């Protein structure tokens, strides 16, 4: 069983990042389960709709009353210490407005932490039948 647990924004870093005050502690944190366009691309640097899912997620997060995050059932940090979780803004979810909003496709899936796959799955799909932004 999920539980929710909270968090205090300090600064949107990119679509897919956001930076937490987490149990006392500043951590980066890398939204599970998505792959949104990048403006921080290592290679490309700034790609399609890149900047419209940075500035997507950083309203969401940035008028929120409530930021909460939820670890999966695997690992909780990935290899460069980024915390890996699902963030929800005054319930919402983070992760799945991206991917509804057809600014993000669904990650390559790493067991255990897929819990909430088949619901961004749905998301994507619905997404991709309405050919919004990434998907026209």
């Known amino acids: 069983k999920l539980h929710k647990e ?7 870093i990119d679509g897919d990042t956001v930076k937490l005050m987490y149990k006392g502690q500043p951590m980066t944190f890398r939204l599970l389960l998505v792959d949104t366009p990048e403006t921080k691309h290592p290679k490309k640097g700034v ?13 969401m997060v940035e008028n929120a009353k409530k930021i909460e995050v939820e670890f999966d059932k695997g690992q909780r940090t990935d290899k460069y210490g980024r ?17 509804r909003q057809g600014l993000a496709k669904v990650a390559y899936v ?13 998301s994507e799909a619905q997404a991709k039948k309405e050919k919004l932004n990434i998907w026209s």
Do not use: C, W
């Open 6 to 12: 909270p968090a205090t924004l300090i600064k949107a």
């Open 83 to 99: 915390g890996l979780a699902y963030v929800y803004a005054d319930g919402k979810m983070v992760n799945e407005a991206l991917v």
């Open 47 to 59: 790609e399609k709709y890149g900047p419209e899912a940075s500035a997507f997620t950083k309203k």
């Open 110 to 122: 790493y067991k255990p932490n897929n819990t909430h796959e088949q619901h961004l799955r749905k």
